[PDB]
Design a protein around this ligand. Structure first.
Ligand SMILES: OC[C@H]1O[C@@H]2O[C@H]3[C@H](O)[C@@H](O)[C@@H](O[C@H]4[C@H](O)[C@@H](O)[C@@H](O[C@H]5[C@H](O)[C@@H](O)[C@@H](O[C@H]6[C@H](O)[C@@H](O)[C@@H](O[C@H]7[C@H](O)[C@@H](O)[C@@H](O[C@H]8[C@H](O)[C@@H](O)[C@@H](O[C@H]1[C@H](O)[C@H]2O)O[C@@H]8CO)O[C@@H]7CO)O[C@@H]6CO)O[C@@H]5CO)O[C@@H]4CO)O[C@@H]3CO
Ligand SMILES: OC[C@H]1O[C@@H]2O[C@H]3[C@H](O)[C@@H](O)[C@@H](O[C@H]4[C@H](O)[C@@H](O)[C@@H](O[C@H]5[C@H](O)[C@@H](O)[C@@H](O[C@H]6[C@H](O)[C@@H](O)[C@@H](O[C@H]7[C@H](O)[C@@H](O)[C@@H](O[C@H]1[C@H](O)[C@H]2O)O[C@@H]7CO)O[C@@H]6CO)O[C@@H]5CO)O[C@@H]4CO)O[C@@H]3CO
Ligand SMILES: CCCCCCCCOCCOCCOCCOCCO
Ligand SMILES: CCCCCCCCOCCOCCOCCOCCO
Ligand SMILES: CCCCCCCCOCCOCCOCCOCCO
Ligand SMILES: CCCCCCCCOCCOCCOCCOCCO
Ligand SMILES: CCCCCCCCOCCOCCOCCOCCO
Ligand SMILES: CCCCCCCCOCCOCCOCCOCCO
Ligand SMILES: CCCCCCCCOCCOCCOCCOCCO
Ligand SMILES: CCCCCCCCOCCOCCOCCOCCO
Length: 311
């Protein structure tokens, strides 16, 4: 018991993420955003004696937004707390529960506000079920999720999102290869109000995607991988939404491609680098009248690098 407290391994590390986004919106102009995320600490804790995994991350985030006649800068701190109590069921089966809390505090600067504060709390509860068949070298990861997101933007009001998701990812290993496909479905309700209670948004949302992944492990080196996502989502406003969005539906097509490489360096260090492309095209059921076109297109390039020390 006292001894079990000391039987942990895991990793400590750091990462940096750079995100370059351009959204050409319904007004047919470019909103350009650059975000840098500095993960000053991330801590993976693994106690096989408890069959318990924990994760903690501290991030500093800075975003700059630029578009015709407007700018916005946002600086934030994000902490993640994650607890995973697992359970070996034998014969290749396992189950467990994840409880995850992510808190973000940020300040926004623009020509119109100076240090407007935003507080975000997101809670994720995920029962999961895994299977691995050693004879076939095939298995799957699966989970359900309840997700609650609550954001207080002070003068800009409050927003709550609440819903569920399901994920199923079968995968197979053969030689140095591993191939998998992630299937994902999410539903949620959005509720956003101004401080006096005026409704900005009341809407129902759903998303689905399928994402194949291929990886190859080099005998004398690391693991190279690629993932490609094709998905869709929809946001359907009730008659109570504001801003001309009453009864309006948004439909989005999603395409992503990722390539990454991870390699161990000696016995303890592991480094990973990854590039992701994302292109998302949105249209409305009906334009309000101010729009220049029925199209809003996001193109995003993300660069990610991570260095971890295993123990
Ligand atoms: O938590 C740190 C981790 O976070 C991120 O990974 C997430 C990932 O993006 C999601 O996809 C998801 O992963 C689920 C996945 O989709 C499912 O396929 C399944 O995973 C199965 C694997 O597919 C299958 O390969 C096998 O995995 C085994 C490995 O092949 C084997 O090498 C070994 O793994 C050990 C590593 O060799 C060792 O280096 C160390 O791993 C560290 C990583 O190197 C490091 O990058 C980091 O990982 C991040 C990751 O980058 C994020 O993308 O920390 C790791 C821990 O230090 O530790 C390994 C332990 O031995 O053994 C494994 C297991 O046998 O089996 C799995 C099924 O178990 O399930 C996934 C959900 O668990 O979730 C994660 C977040 O956890
Ligand atoms: O060029 C101006 C602007 O025009 C277009 O926006 C549309 C928008 O697409 C429509 O949906 C609608 O907006 C409604 C919303 O539906 C409703 O939510 C509400 O908006 C509130 C926000 O939800 C809340 O977050 C806050 O918004 C802040 C915001 O966080 C800041 O980012 C800042 O907004 C700027 C944008 O960043 C910038 O892109 C641009 O907006 C364009 C937009 O690209 C285009 O699609 O300018 C704005 C402001 O300069 O500021 C606000 C706070 O001022 O506050 C609101 C308060 O309700 O209200 C709107 C209004 O109906 O209609 C707009 C305009 O037609
Ligand atoms: C652990 C508390 C750390 C102090 O919070 C600093 C700001 O971090 C933003 C996230 O808020 C989490 C508060 O808990
Ligand atoms: O092929 C059918 C038999 O394979 C059983 C192994 O489990 C694979 C996981 O299913 C996805
Ligand atoms: C049974 C929970 C254990 C908690 C302790 C379709 C996606 O399938 C996911 C099934 O997950 C159930 C777990
Ligand atoms: C608060 C704790 C909730 C944890 O349970 C999460 C399980 O949710 C399963 C989702 O199943 C689909 C939901 O259907 C509602 C529509
Ligand atoms: C990649 O395929 C390699 C062959 O896998 C051998 C096992 O065959 C069992 C059935 O798998 C079909 C999926
Ligand atoms: C369990 C996971 C739920 C499966 C739903 C995923 C279905 O994917 C369809 C995506 O295709 C988008 C086009
Ligand atoms: C047999 C030794 C293998 C020599 C190198 C060939 C490996 O090619 C891997 C390409 O896979 C890309 C993964 O994505
Ligand atoms: C800093 C972000 C850049 C991310 C780029 C990731 C590109 C991954 O491809 C790496 C290709 O190298 C594979 C190694 O080949 C085997 C060597 O042994």
């Amino acid at each position: 018991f006292d001894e079990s407290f000391f039987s942990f391994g895991g990793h400590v590390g750091t990462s940096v993420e750079y995100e370059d986004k351009v959204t050409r919106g319904f007004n047919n102009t470019d909103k350009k955003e650059k975000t840098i995320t500095n993960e000053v600490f991330n801590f993976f804790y693994n106690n096989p004696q408890w069959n318990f995994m924990g994760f903690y991350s501290f991030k500093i985030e800075n975003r700059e937004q630029k578009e015709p006649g407007y700018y916005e800068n946002e600086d934030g701190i994000k902490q993640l707390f994650s607890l995973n109590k697992g359970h070996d069921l034998g014969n290749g089966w396992a189950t467990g529960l994840i409880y995850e809390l992510e808190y973000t505090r940020s300040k926004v600067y623009s020509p119109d506000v100076s240090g407007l504060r935003k507080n975000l709390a997101e809670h994720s509860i995920r029962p999961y079920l895994t299977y691995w068949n050693n004879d076939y070298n095939m298995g799957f990861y699966s989970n359900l999720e309840y997700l609650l997101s609550k954001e207080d933007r002070n003068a800009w009001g409050k927003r709550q999102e609440q819903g569920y998701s399901a994920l199923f990812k079968p995968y197979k290993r053969f030689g140095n290869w591993e191939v998998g496909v992630e299937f994902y479905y999410q539903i949620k309700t959005n509720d956003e109000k101004q401080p006096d209670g005026t409704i900005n948004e009341k809407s129902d949302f759903n998303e689905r995607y399928i994402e194949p992944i291929v990886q190859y492990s080099f005998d004398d080196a690391g693991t190279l991988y690629t993932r490609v996502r094709v998905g869709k989502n929809e946001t359907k406003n009730t008659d109570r939404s504001g801003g001309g969005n009453a009864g309006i539906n948004y439909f989005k097509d999603i395409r992503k491609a990722t390539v990454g490489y991870e390699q161990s360096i000696g016995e303890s260090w592991v480094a990973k680098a990854e590039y992701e492309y994302a292109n998302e095209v949105e249209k409305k059921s009906r334009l309000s009248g101010w729009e220049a076109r029925n199209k809003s297109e996001l193109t995003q390039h993300t660069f990610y690098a991570q260095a971890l020390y295993r123990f």
